[PDB]
Amino acid sequence: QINQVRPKLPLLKILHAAGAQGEMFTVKEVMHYLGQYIMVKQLYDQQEQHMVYCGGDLLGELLGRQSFSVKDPSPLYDMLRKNLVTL
């Protein structure tokens, strides 16, 4: 369906870790589970919570970065573009 995407394997593993089921999702669902993954694994900086530290995490491998800021999402969106198969 046009509003769905198919996450590549490593990103799917991350979504499943956060409780997702299945293989295809809407972008809102992907963001929901990726946010949950970051929250429950407590990867965000406790003082500056828009900062996410993921060195050594599969998420860091996907981002090609040790950290990123939710305020400047471009690196996160670049990661999604490379890891979401669309129609």
Binding site: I38, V52, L76
Partner: peptide
């Protein structure tokens, strides 16, 4: 000030 506050604004 919270991760969720910032994260939630990435989607409409």
């Amino acid at each position: 000030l919270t991760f969720e506050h910032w994260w939630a604004q990435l989607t409409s």
